[PDB]
UniProtKB/Swiss-Prot annotation, chain A:
PROSITE patterns: RIBOSOMAL_L14. It comes from Saccharomyces cerevisiae (strain ATCC 204508 / S288c) (Baker's yeast). GO terms for molecular function: large ribosomal subunit rRNA binding; structural constituent of ribosome. There are 2 genes for uL14 in yeast. The gene is RPL23A. This is Large ribosomal subunit protein uL14A. The modification N6,N6-dimethyllysine is found at K105, K109. The modification N-acetylserine is found at S1. InterPro entries: Ribosomal_uL14 (IPR000218), Ribosomal_uL14_CS (IPR019972), Ribosomal_uL14_sf (IPR036853). One of its GO terms (cellular component) is cytosol. The keyword Acyltransferase does not apply. One of its GO terms (biological process) is cytoplasmic translation. Keywords: Acetylation, Cytoplasm, Methylation, Ribonucleoprotein, Ribosomal protein. Methylated by RKM1 at 2 different sites, but it is unclear which are the 2 methylated residues among Lys-39, Lys-105 and/or Lys-109.
From Swiss-Prot, chain B:
The modification Phosphoserine is found at S7. One of its GO terms (cellular component) is cytosolic large ribosomal subunit. It comes from Saccharomyces cerevisiae (strain ATCC 204508 / S288c). The gene is RPL24A. Keywords: Cytoplasm, Phosphoprotein, Ribonucleoprotein, Ribosomal protein. The chain holds residues 1 to 98 of 155 of the full protein. This is Large ribosomal subunit protein eL24A.
From Swiss-Prot, chain D:
It is found in: Cytoplasm. This is Large ribosomal subunit protein uL3. Component of the large ribosomal subunit (LSU). Mature yeast ribosomes consist of a small (40S) and a large (60S) subunit. The 40S small subunit contains 1 molecule of ribosomal RNA (18S rRNA) and 33 different proteins (encoded by 57 genes). The large 60S subunit contains 3 rRNA molecules (25S, 5.8S and 5S rRNA) and 46 different proteins (encoded by 81 genes). uL3 forms together with ES39L one of the contact sites for the signal recognition particle that targets ribosomes to the endoplasmic reticulum membrane. Disulfide bonds: none annotated. Present with 450 molecules/cell in log phase SD medium. Disruption phenotype: A mutant confers resistance to trichodermin, a trichotecene toxin produced by plant-pathogenic fungi. The chain holds residues 340 to 387 of 387 of the full protein. Component of the ribosome, a large ribonucleoprotein complex responsible for the synthesis of proteins in the cell. The small ribosomal subunit (SSU) binds messenger RNAs (mRNAs) and translates the encoded message by selecting cognate aminoacyl-transfer RNA (tRNA) molecules. The large subunit (LSU) contains the ribosomal catalytic site termed the peptidyl transferase center (PTC), which catalyzes the formation of peptide bonds, thereby polymerizing the amino acids delivered by tRNAs into a polypeptide chain.
Curated annotation (Swiss-Prot), chain E:
Component of the small ribosomal subunit (SSU). Mature yeast ribosomes consist of a small (40S) and a large (60S) subunit. The 40S small subunit contains 1 molecule of ribosomal RNA (18S rRNA) and 33 different proteins (encoded by 57 genes). The large 60S subunit contains 3 rRNA molecules (25S, 5.8S and 5S rRNA) and 46 different proteins (encoded by 81 genes). Interacts with snoRNA U3. uS11 interacts with MPP10. Component of the ribosomal small subunit (SSU) processome composed of at least 40 protein subunits and snoRNA U3. It is found in: Cytoplasm; Nucleus, Nucleolus. The chain holds residues 1 to 177 of 236 of the full protein. This is Small ribosomal subunit protein eS6A. There is a cross-link at K116, K131, K149 (Glycyl lysine isopeptide (Lys-Gly) (interchain with G-Cter in ubiquitin)). The lineage of its organism: Eukaryota, Fungi, Dikarya, Ascomycota, Saccharomycotina. It comes from Saccharomyces cerevisiae (strain ATCC 204508 / S288c) (Baker's yeast).
Length: 136, 98, 48, 48, 177
RNA sequence: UGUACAACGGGGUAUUGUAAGCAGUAGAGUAGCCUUGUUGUUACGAUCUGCUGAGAUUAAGCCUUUGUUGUCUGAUUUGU
RNA sequence: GAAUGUUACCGCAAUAGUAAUUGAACUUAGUACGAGAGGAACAGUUCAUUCGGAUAAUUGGUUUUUGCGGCUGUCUGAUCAGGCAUUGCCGCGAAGCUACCAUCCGCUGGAUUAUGGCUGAACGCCUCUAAGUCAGAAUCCAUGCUAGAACGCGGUGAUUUC
RNA sequence: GCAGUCAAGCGUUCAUAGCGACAUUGCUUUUUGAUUCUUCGAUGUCGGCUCUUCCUAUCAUACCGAAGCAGAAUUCGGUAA
RNA sequence: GUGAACAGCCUCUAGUUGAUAGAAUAAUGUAGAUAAGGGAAGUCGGCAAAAUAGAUCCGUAACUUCGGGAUAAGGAUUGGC
C-alpha cells in the first residue's frame, strides 16, 4: 500500500509470497510479474513477505517486451486465488493471480486492464478503478 | 441480507457460507459447500447429478400441485365512452336492438 | 452451549463498513436463574 | 462485570441483530427450520 | 420503493411510496403475473388484490416477463419484444434487462388492481378517465352498440365537440370497411 | 427405587447420491421356432427409466425419547 | 503424594512470574514558517505490523466414520452379498483435531528519571536548591492477569457405637 | 577498539554550534600479539540451524536539553536495554 | 487367471498359521500417507519428496566416428457392450 493509496485497507489473507509470479493484466507489454518485495510489510525471522489484493509489490517482468525486462518496478495486485474473507461474511477467490505495473504514486503504466478486478483494490487505487472493466 | 443460491446445486446459501468463485470471464459462481464446489471444479454436469434442483427440474421430480389448476381472473364490465364526445349521449344511443 | 453466526448492520462512522452488514461469530452460554443460598462477610486486616 | 468503564466507541456501539443463524452445526446446514426445509424439499417418502 | 398502481376499470393511475422493508417485503420473490393481497402493504389497501406487472430497478432497467431470475442479465432482443424498439429492419440489440422477480433493488413496482378493496383509494377508485378514441372501423361501431347489419352506421359514429373561439365544431372519424 | 441409570427401539440432525426386487413400447442389437408376419411369436442384450432425494450409515466425544428390557448394599479405612 | 483429629465446601494472599509492540492513511492543512521552492504537530477517526491468550459459528486442511458411491485383478458355480491386494485405488465425506489459511480478546491508577519550573537563602544583588516545592518518560510500584507456601492462613458443613 | 584534558587551528566573521593539530590522561577485553598457569591415562574445530538469557559503547521506538533549529529534514547531548 | 512375462496381485494341490501376552492410544519417535495459496524464497547443494511411466498412432533439434543422438522434445488415444 502506502503512497497514493488514499484509503486504509482491511486485512486479507496473504496469498503471494516473494517469488510468486502473477499474470500481468494490463496492456503495458509485460506478460507476467515476479514479486520481489511487498511494500508496507514487516519483519520476522524466516517469514516471506507476502502480498495480497490491493498491495503494492516491487516486481520484475520475467516475460514480456525487452524494454520492460531486467529492472525492478512497482506493481499492484489485482486478483488473488488464495481465498479470503470480507467483512460481509464471504470467502471468495479468483482463478488467477494478477497485477498491473505502476509508478510509486500508484499510477498505471498501461491503459487498460484485462480481467475482473477485486473491489478492495479498486477502492484503494483510483487509476486502477478507471481502467477496470468488471469489479469483483 | 440476501439468501443466495448455489450455481451448481441451487441450494440456498445463507450469509457467510460456502465459497464464491470469480472466473476468468468475470462470471461469478457461488457454492454452498465444498461438495458442489468439487463437482463443479470436476466439470461435472448438474443435470446428471441426481440430487440437484437442476437435475430435478429437468427430470420433472415431484412438482405435483404446481401443474394443478388455479383461481385467478377478473370481473369488470364498465363504460367510460370516448374523450371529447359527450359521454351523456353514449348510453341513450347505447340501447341496442339486438 | 455453543456458537453460531450473526448478521447486523455496522454503526461506525468513517469505517468502510459504516452502515453495511457484517457477519460475526458469537457464543451462547446457557444461563438459568441462579439461586441465593448464603452470605459471607469479609473484613480488612494488615494480612489482607 | 467489567473492571473499568470502557469508552472505546467500539464498546458503546449499540447493536441490533438482523439475523441469527440457526441451521444445524452437525454438518453443512442448509436449513434454518423444519418448516423451511419442508418448503424446499416437498413431500418425502415418510411424511403424509 | 415506489408503487405504480393502475385501476384499469377506470383507466386511472397514481403512485404510492412505501417505506418500511416489512411492508415492502410482501412482494419479494413474487414474480410478474403473481397476485398479491393488500393489507400487508398498507391498511388502506386491505381488501385489494394486486397483480405484479413489471417495474424498474435503480439505474432504471426494466423487468421482462418470464426471465425468471431476480437480477439483471444481458439479452439479444428482437423485433416484437419488451424493452427494445428496433431502429432498422432486422436489427437486434444486446441489452441489459432486469429479471421478473421482485427484490429490494427495484426503484418501482408496477401493479394492476384486479379486485377492489374494502375502502376507496384516493385518485384511483374515486376518479375515472374516458377512452381517447371511439370505433372507426364499420363493424367495430356495430359491436360497440350491437346493431346488426341493418341499423346503418353513420349516425352511431362518435362526434367530438371542439370550440373555435365563438364556433364549436363537430368532427367524426371516417368509417372504414 | 426416580425428571434414576443402562441396552435396545423410535423421532430429529448428518453423509452419500438413488438399494435389493420387480416391471417396461426405453436399448447399438442377437439368437431360435413356425403359422414366414399386414407391431408373428419366445426368450437374451452394456445401459436406460419407474416405484425411488431412494437405500445405507448416523455417536463411538451429535440432539431427543411417555416405548421394550434390565440394573440398583461388593471391598477397605478414618477420631479432636 | 505420607504426616499436623477425619472428611467436604467456600475463600484469603505471602512469595514468584507478568506483556504488549510498531507503522500508515484521513482529518488538522496545502495551515503554522517561508521571498520562493516547499511544508509540520497536538486533539479526533479508520485501519495495519510484530507479539500474546484463546477459540472452531464460518472457510480451508486432515479421513480407518474404512460412512455412502465408483473402479481394476482374482477368489466364493451364477445371482444377491462379499473376501483378498501391509488401509488395493478413486470422488464425496460428518465428528474430532486444527491455520494470520479461520474468528475473537489483550486493563488504568500512582510514584519517579532526564529536563523545564515555583518560592528561596547562602552572597542586602543574583540564582530550579542549600531547607521546602510544581510539572514530568516505552522507567518503577500498584491495578489487572497466572501459580498458590505441598511445614502460611480464614469462614463454613457433617463428623462412625456392635 | 572506545572515551577524555589543554586549545593552536577549522568553521565567511567567531577556539569549544559541530570539529580539532602538537602534546597528554585513560578505559575496554568480540582484534592481534606477549606469556605458558590448568588440561596431552582427551574438556570432539569453523560456519550455519534452533533456543534462552544477559551487557550497553542506543540503530529504531517514549520524554527531553543544543544547534551555524525559519519551516521540512538533520546533527550534538541527557534519562533510557 | 490377469498380463509381454518364471513381474506384481488373487487362487488349486501341498504346507503353515511359528515370532510373550493383556489394557490404553500422552509427549518424542520409527515406518506409511495428505495438505489451501505460493513454488526452491529452504539448503553447501533440490538432500528427501513429488512429478514421469504401459501400449497404439502422430511428431521429433544441435551435433555425429553416419552406426547414432532417440522413448529426443512434443502431442492424441485407451473402459463396457
Ligand atoms: Mg494479455
Ligand atoms: Mg532463515
Ligand atoms: Mg530467456
Ligand atoms: Mg482512462
Ligand atoms: Mg476439500
Ligand atoms: Mg471440509
Ligand atoms: Mg459442524
Ligand atoms: Mg377501407
Ligand atoms: Mg443393564
Ligand atoms: Mg430415484
Ligand atoms: Mg478417548
Ligand atoms: Mg419403540
Ligand atoms: Mg490427608
Ligand atoms: Mg488536502
Ligand atoms: Mg529565507
Ligand atoms: Mg514484537
Ligand atoms: Mg473438518
Ligand atoms: Mg466401499
Ligand atoms: Mg437381476
Ligand atoms: Mg485366501
Ligand atoms: Mg503379498
Ligand atoms: Mg495470533
Ligand atoms: Mg484496571
Ligand atoms: Mg524565578
Ligand atoms: Mg529540579
Ligand atoms: Mg535536592
Ligand atoms: Mg548551594
Ligand atoms: Mg507499557
Ligand atoms: Mg505507589
Ligand atoms: Mg491484563
Ligand atoms: Mg497450600
Ligand atoms: Mg484450610
Ligand atoms: Mg573489537
Ligand atoms: Mg596549543
Ligand atoms: Mg561562534
Ligand atoms: Mg580564527
Ligand atoms: Mg596454553
Ligand atoms: Mg590434552
Ligand atoms: Mg584427562
Ligand atoms: Mg570425552
Ligand atoms: Mg563436555
Ligand atoms: Mg547510558
Ligand atoms: Mg534531558
Ligand atoms: Mg552564528
Ligand atoms: Mg529486556
Ligand atoms: Mg541492568
Ligand atoms: Mg516345510
Ligand atoms: Mg522376538
Ligand atoms: Mg510379526
Ligand atoms: Mg504389546
Ligand atoms: Mg501445498
Ligand atoms: Mg509453477
Ligand atoms: Mg537460495
Ligand atoms: Mg526459478
Ligand atoms: Mg538462505
Ligand atoms: Mg557446493
Ligand atoms: Mg552457497
Ligand atoms: Mg533423490
Ligand atoms: Mg498430487
Ligand atoms: Mg538430448
Ligand atoms: Mg471407444
Amino acid at each position: 500500500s502506502g503512497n497514493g493509496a488514499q484509503g486504509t485497507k482491511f486485512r486479507i489473507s496473504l496469498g503471494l509470497p516473494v517469488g510468486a509470479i502473477m499474470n500481468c493484466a494490463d496492456n503495458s507489454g509485460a506478460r507476467n510479474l515476479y514479486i520481489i518485495a511487498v511494500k508496507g510489510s514487516g519483519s520476522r525471522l524466516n517469514r516471506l513477505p507476502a502480498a495480497s489484493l490491493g498491495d503494492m509489490v516491487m516486481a520484475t517482468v520475467k516475460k514480456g517486451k525487452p524494454e520492460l525486462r531486467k529492472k525492478v518496478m512497482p506493481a499492484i495486485v489485482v486478483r488473488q486465488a488464495k481465498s479470503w474473507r470480507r467483512r460481509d461474511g464471504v470467502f471468495l477467490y479468483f482463478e488467477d493471480n494478477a497485477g498491473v505495473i505502476a509508478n510509486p504514486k500508484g499510477e498505471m503504466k498501461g491503459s487498460a486492464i484485462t480481467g475482473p478486478v477485486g473491489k478492495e483494490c479498486a477502492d484503494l487505487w483510483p487509476r486502477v478503478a478507471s481502467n477496470s472493466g468488471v469489479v469483483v | 441480507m440476501k439468501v443466495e443460491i448455489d450455481s451448481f446445486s441451487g441450494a440456498k446459501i445463507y450469509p457467510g457460507r460456502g465459497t464464491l468463485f470469480v472466473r476468468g470471464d468475470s462470471k461469478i459462481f457461488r457454492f454452498q459447500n465444498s461438495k458442489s464446489a468439487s463437482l463443479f471444479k470436476q466439470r461435472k454436469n448438474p443435470r446428471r447429478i441426481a440430487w440437484t434442483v437442476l437435475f430435478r427440474k429437468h427430470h420433472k421430480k415431484g412438482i405435483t400441485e404446481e401443474v394443478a389448476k388455479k383461481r385467478s381472473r377478473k370481473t369488470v364490465k364498465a363504460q367510460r365512452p370516448i374523450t371529447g364526445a359527450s359521454l351523456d349521449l353514449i348510453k341513450e344511443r347505447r340501447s341496442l336492438k339486438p | 452451549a455453543g456458537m453460531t453466526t450473526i448478521v447486523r448492520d455496522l454503526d461506525r462512522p468513517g469505517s468502510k463498513f459504516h452502515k453495511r452488514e457484517v457477519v460475526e461469530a458469537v457464543t451462547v452460554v446457557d444461563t438459568p436463574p441462579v439461586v441465593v443460598v448464603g452470605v459471607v462477610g469479609y473484613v480488612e486486616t494488615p494480612r489482607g | 462485570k467489567s473492571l473499568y468503564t470502557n469508552t472505546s466507541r467500539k464498546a458503546l456501539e449499540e447493536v441490533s441483530l438482523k439475523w441469527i443463524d440457526t441451521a444445524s452445526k452437525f454438518g453443512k446446514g442448509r436449513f434454518q427450520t423444519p418448516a423451511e426445509k419442508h418448503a424446499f424439499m416437498g413431500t418425502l417418502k415418510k411424511d403424509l | 420503493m415506489k408503487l405504480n398502481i393502475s385501476y384499469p376499470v377506470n383507466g386511472s393511475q397514481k403512485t404510492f411510496e412505501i417505506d418500511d422493508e416489512h411492508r415492502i417485503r410482501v412482494f419479494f420473490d413474487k414474480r410478474i403475473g403473481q397476485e398479491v393481497d393488500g393489507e400487508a402493504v398498507g391498511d388502506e389497501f386491505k381488501g385489494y388484490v394486486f397483480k405484479i406487472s413489471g417495474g424498474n430497478d435503480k439505474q432504471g432497467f426494466p423487468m421482462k416477463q418470464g426471465v425468471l431470475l431476480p437480477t439483471r442479465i444481458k439479452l439479444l432482443l428482437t423485433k416484437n419484444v419488451s424493452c427494445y424498439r428496433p431502429r432498422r429492419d432486422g436489427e437486434r440489440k444486446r441489452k441489459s434487462v432486469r429479471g421478473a422477480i421482485v427484490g429490494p433493488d427495484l426503484a418501482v413496482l408496477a401493479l394492476v388492481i384486479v379486485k377492489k378493496g374494502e375502502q376507496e383509494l384516493e385518485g384511483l377508485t374515486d376518479t375515472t378517465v374516458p377512452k381517447r378514441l371511439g370505433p372507426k372501423r364499420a363493424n367495430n361501431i356495430r359491436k360497440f352498440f350491437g346493431l346488426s347489419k341493418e341499423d346503418d352506421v353513420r349516425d352511431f359514429v362518435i362526434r367530438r365537440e371542439v370550440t373555435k373561439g365563438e364556433k364549436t365544431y363537430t368532427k367524426a372519424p371516417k368509417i372504414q370497411r
